[PDB]
A paper describes a structure:
The SARS-CoV-2 spike glycoprotein is the major surface antigen of the virus. Its function is to bind the host receptor ACE2 and mediate the subsequent membrane fusion required for cell entry. Here we have examined the structures and receptor-binding properties of spikes of the B.1.1.7 variant first described in Kent, United Kingdom (now termed Alpha)10,16–19 and the B.1.351 variant first described in South Africa (now termed Beta). Recently emerging variants of SARS-CoV-2 have acquired other substitutions in the spike including a number located at the monomer-monomer interfaces, at the receptor-binding site, and near the furin-cleavage site.
Similarly, we also show that the Y453F substitution in the RBD of mink spike, a structure of which we also report here, only increases affinity for human ACE2 if residue 614 is a glycine but not if it is an aspartic acid.
Numbering used by the authors:
A (entry chain C): 1001 to 1049
B (entry chain C): 707 to 804
C (entry chain C): 855 to 940, 944 to 951
D (entry chain B): 707 to 827, 855 to 940, 944 to 1146
E (entry chain A): 609 to 621, 641 to 675, 690 to 706
The structure:
Amino acid sequence: LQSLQTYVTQQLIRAAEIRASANLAATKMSECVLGQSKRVDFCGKGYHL
Amino acid sequence: YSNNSIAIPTNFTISVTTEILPVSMTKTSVDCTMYICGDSTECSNLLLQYGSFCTQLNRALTGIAVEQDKNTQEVFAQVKQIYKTPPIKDFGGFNFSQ
Amino acid sequence: FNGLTVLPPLLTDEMIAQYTSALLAGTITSGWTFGAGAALQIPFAMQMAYRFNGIGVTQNVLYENQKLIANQFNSAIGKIQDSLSSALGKLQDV
Amino acid sequence: YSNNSIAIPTNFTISVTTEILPVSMTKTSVDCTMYICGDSTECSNLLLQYGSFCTQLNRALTGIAVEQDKNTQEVFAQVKQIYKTPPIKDFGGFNFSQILPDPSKPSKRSFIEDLLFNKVTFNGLTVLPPLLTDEMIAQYTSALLAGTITSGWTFGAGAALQIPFAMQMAYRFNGIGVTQNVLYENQKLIANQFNSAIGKIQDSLSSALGKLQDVVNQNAQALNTLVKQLSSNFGAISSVLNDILSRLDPPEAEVQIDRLITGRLQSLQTYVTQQLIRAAEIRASANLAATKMSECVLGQSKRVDFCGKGYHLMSFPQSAPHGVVFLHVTYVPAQEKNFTTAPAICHDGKAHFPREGVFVSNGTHWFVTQRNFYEPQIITTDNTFVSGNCDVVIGIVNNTVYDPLQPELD
Amino acid sequence: AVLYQGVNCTEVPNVFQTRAGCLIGAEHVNNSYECDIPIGAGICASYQQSVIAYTMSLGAENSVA
Ligand SMILES: *[C@@H]1O[C@H](CO[C@@H]2O[C@@H](C)[C@@H](O)[C@@H](O)[C@@H]2O)[C@@H](O[C@@H]2O[C@H](CO)[C@@H](O)[C@H](O)[C@H]2NC(C)=O)[C@H](O)[C@H]1NC(C)=O
Ligand SMILES: *[C@@H]1O[C@H](CO)[C@@H](O[C@@H]2O[C@H](CO)[C@@H](O)[C@H](O)[C@H]2NC(C)=O)[C@H](O)[C@H]1NC(C)=O
Ligand SMILES: *[C@@H]1O[C@H](CO)[C@@H](O[C@@H]2O[C@H](CO)[C@@H](O)[C@H](O)[C@H]2NC(C)=O)[C@H](O)[C@H]1NC(C)=O
Ligand SMILES: *[C@@H]1O[C@H](CO)[C@@H](O[C@@H]2O[C@H](CO)[C@@H](O)[C@H](O)[C@H]2NC(C)=O)[C@H](O)[C@H]1NC(C)=O
Ligand SMILES: *[C@@H]1O[C@H](CO)[C@@H](O)[C@H](O)[C@H]1NC(C)=O
Ligand SMILES: *[C@@H]1O[C@H](CO)[C@@H](O)[C@H](O)[C@H]1NC(C)=O
Ligand SMILES: *[C@@H]1O[C@H](CO)[C@@H](O)[C@H](O)[C@H]1NC(C)=O
Ligand SMILES: *[C@@H]1O[C@H](CO)[C@@H](O)[C@H](O)[C@H]1NC(C)=O
Ligand SMILES: *[C@@H]1O[C@H](CO)[C@@H](O)[C@H](O)[C@H]1NC(C)=O
Ligand SMILES: *[C@@H]1O[C@H](CO)[C@@H](O)[C@H](O)[C@H]1NC(C)=O
């Protein structure tokens, strides 16, 4: 039972990290692909096209 | 640096860069009674006295599992319709075949 | 075999590929207008001239150097393709 | 798609959308000695040997509790002063009565706020009251909204500066790339569209708040599991300490009291850990809400799909139980038409390019228009600039460019 | 000052009753200022002499012309 609890806890923490990464990816899809971004180094180095 | 000197570029370069981003992870589920006890009924009766420990574990794992699908849908599903490219491909000199 | 199961995801890989192709075709045919509303067609060179206006350079700079820019873009895509087939550590760590 | 075909919209639509965001969660505290032991002194002495387990739990819960108040203050408290709306309400034809406060309603909440509030519904466990009462949050929201409709975006940067509402909306159309005369010529149509959109939002709500309800359900479920966990034996003869204390002498009672202590302590630790993880998630959501308040409400956003679908114009905040609601107004093009287009025009051995426009043809004549609206105009040297000769450009066309000065000289 | 959280002032061994609980040792004042030390439900505490309790003020009030 202790082993199972340890496993589930670390899975919850990893899932939170992956959720943050997925939110970043969705924002990049909206702002870099559907539009043209004036934010510096968000989409890439240089001037985004 | 000088107080009356400037530098102006006279040409340009087009650069393409790649970025990698994880979106989702694998979806797994665990059955407490099978993992802890197997097919033993004595072990099951002994396990019942630590009541409600497995329901919470199953709820946690199910929540993670549904969150993964929500992640993927949030990232990719952003188009109302499925647009198609014309059979004739004249985009100036740009070559998007790859 | 100890109660551990793996569940299949809702969206198969073909569906994700279809989504990606729809996004990319909409981009190259309509520009940025399909995000705001209905897609509106515009020739590709004219859209790239709009984007040069977006970064602070005039349109004639694009129209006078169109072949040079096209060649540079094609070479950059080729280099990306060669670089990959020789980088995905973030995905492998998961 | 074709290499000389373009589509230009000839009309527009004003659309209002709603967004829901959780901000904070309920604040709870748990007393370890009362939960685990109750009023038993033998249980307390046995508990002391697992030293420092409860102080950490109390510190964790207190940290979560203070973080919730910091979340709410970060989101709503962004105005220096409490601005007020004038008694005379002439904002062109725009009607903000639904979102504005009315004294008759409780807590002086607006109509939509009242609709929003109705939709969302002894063992050492205590619930602490939040620092900011609902009336204070409503006052903050009304100050933000009145400042917006009276001064525009100037109250965020510094002191508020008054400007008539139609002029501010014309500034925002300049912000999205359309000219001012497009607003001034179609003012009544836009006002009617905005009013109808607000009406539809009001009808839609009174018939959507699942994100706010999920938080309440999760908190209640966690507390119910915590309380239900007291009934377990964990291997002892019974789950009641008062029964074990009787019927048994201390040397025999201590082992079973130990089993009960171990089980209940493990239950408390599980509860606190899941609460910490949920609090981190809520903090991320509150940070998103604060950023949206700064960038969509106090300003006008050029980021795509941040504030809403379409081209952002302005946003209005409302308060909901443990959360915030954003009403985003956006501009959507409509009723498009087909034309043929060219990159440049070759006149008199020169190339002319548009200043902030696009060349279009209705099949016989060539005009220059703005990109987001169809307002064709004649091509003159005031609309266009010259660069080089006609050889280089691919797709150049032949036309004539009217020179305004020549008729005056003749 | 001492705050007994959640109990009625009758059930205790300058007694001011707040939605947070029973506050003993602090004097209520009609004036309002910024918070300083926070108690629940819109009541704050500060020192200015004895400890005082008041309702916090959101900010200054003005009307745009
Ligand atoms: C193409 O347009 C020209 C010009 O019409 C002007 O621009 C239009 C976009 C619209 O705003 C009109 O109201 C403008 O007058 C058309 O030429 C005109 O045609 C009308 C009708 O026959 C005639 O009375 C005018 O004298 C014409 N103007 C000139 C300068 O000759 C033309 O007919 C349009 N072509 C097609 C195929 O529709
Ligand atoms: C700007 O840079 C480009 C890229 O190097 C130059 O184009 C190259 O010119 C040389 C010499 O004429 C050729 O050998 C290359 O093949 C060209 N490359 C491409 C991709 O066309 C261009 O000459 C530079 N501009 C100026 C004014 O020097
Ligand atoms: C642009 O769209 C608006 C909105 O539909 C049109 O206004 C409508 O016009 C019809 C016909 O005249 C009326 O029956 C509706 O009552 C109008 N609606 C509103 C809200 O005023 C407008 O006519 C369109 N513009 C053009 C040039 O067709
Ligand atoms: C635009 O006008 C120019 C000049 O009037 C045209 O250029 C001529 O094209 C013909 C086509 O064979 C040549 O024979 C001439 O030598 C060119 N120059 C002149 C001065 O006539 C050009 O063709 C026109 N463009 C279009 C699309 O008709
Ligand atoms: C585009 O690239 C592919 C692959 O390098 C090549 O075969 C093709 O000739 C190029 N041009 C066109 C018009 O497809
Ligand atoms: C604004 O809307 C309200 C509610 O629909 C309506 O009663 C009122 O007449 C409208 N106009 C003004 C000027 O308040
Ligand atoms: C433009 O013409 C094409 C011709 O096939 C048609 O399919 C398209 O719908 C037209 N565009 C508009 C906006 O009517
Ligand atoms: C457009 O494509 C046609 C072939 O379909 C070609 O004849 C014409 O020159 C092209 N126009 C431009 C501006 O490249
Ligand atoms: C305290 O008790 C009195 C009567 O004993 C009652 O009137 C009052 O409402 C009580 N206060 C609270 C907060 O319950
Ligand atoms: C505070 O307000 C109450 C209620 O009106 C009043 O009875 C009391 O005299 C006031 N105290 C002071 C110091 O103004």
